[PDB]
Amino acid sequence: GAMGYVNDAFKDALQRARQIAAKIGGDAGTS
């Protein structure tokens, strides 16, 4: 799709991003 306004890449990003925050930053329970 359109770059800069990435739809998949940045969602890949954030699944990892809150994963990394889940261990340290904000515990959400399981994941």
Binding site: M3, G4, Y5, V6, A9, F10, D12, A13, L14, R16, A17, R18, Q19, I20, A21, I24, G25, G26
Partner: protein, 199 residues
């Protein structure tokens, strides 16, 4: 060599002027507001009277001018309260302009992106999650903070491609870490001690 200014241009670029201070915020608050940007190195504060109504102005000096850049670009454009602050001193601009454009172009040779507002616990490889999910990174390190013990809320990440860097910047601002949106930018001066002579 007395008075270590080390290029007066850079010395001032690392220190932003804060004018039109809201009211219920002072050096106490401003320190934290720009804390995710860069570590407060020094503050030129104007406390008027014992009353502490901060009647005057303040200067926030960082350890890195990149934090100062983000403080200019983002904080002056986005109202952090019911009053917009004026960041910087439009006076010596133009004179130091060729230097600014030189530094930016010079640091561009390393095409490194600047990551600020980094969550204190969230680590280097963690910030990699988002950046490396868009593009490829050759070097990633958040500056370690000796007094915090962990790391400063910023770091310098290096893309191998200038295209991917620009892609990241467009989305990395939104990087939510526990309620806070991150803040990305670019490196304005070469953040590496490549100074052979300590003059």
């Amino acid at each position: 060599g007395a008075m270590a200014q080390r290029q007066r241009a850079l010395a001032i670029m690392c220190r932003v002027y804060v004018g039109s201070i809201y009211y219920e915020l002072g050096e106490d608050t401003i320190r934290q507001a720009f804390a995710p940007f860069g570590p407060i190195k020094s503050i030129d504060m104007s406390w008027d009277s014992v009353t502490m109504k901060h009647k005057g102005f303040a200067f926030v000096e960082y350890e890195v001018p990149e934090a100062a850049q983000l403080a200019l670009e983002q904080m002056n454009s986005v109202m952090l309260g019911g009053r917009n602050i004026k960041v910087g001193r439009p006076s010596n601009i133009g004179q130091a302009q060729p230097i600014i454009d030189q530094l930016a172009e010079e640091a561009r040779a390393f095409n490194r992106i600047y990551v600020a507002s980094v969550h204190q616990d969230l680590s280097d490889d963690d910030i990699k999650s988002v950046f490396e999910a868009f593009g490829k990174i050759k070097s990633c390190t958040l500056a370690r903070d000796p007094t915090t013990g962990k790391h400063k809320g910023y770091g310098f990440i290096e893309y191998e491609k200038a295209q991917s860097s620009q892609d990241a910047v467009s989305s990395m601002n939104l990087f939510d870490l526990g309620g806070q949106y991150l803040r990305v930018g670019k490196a304005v001066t070469p953040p590496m001690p490549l100074l052979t002579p300590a003059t």
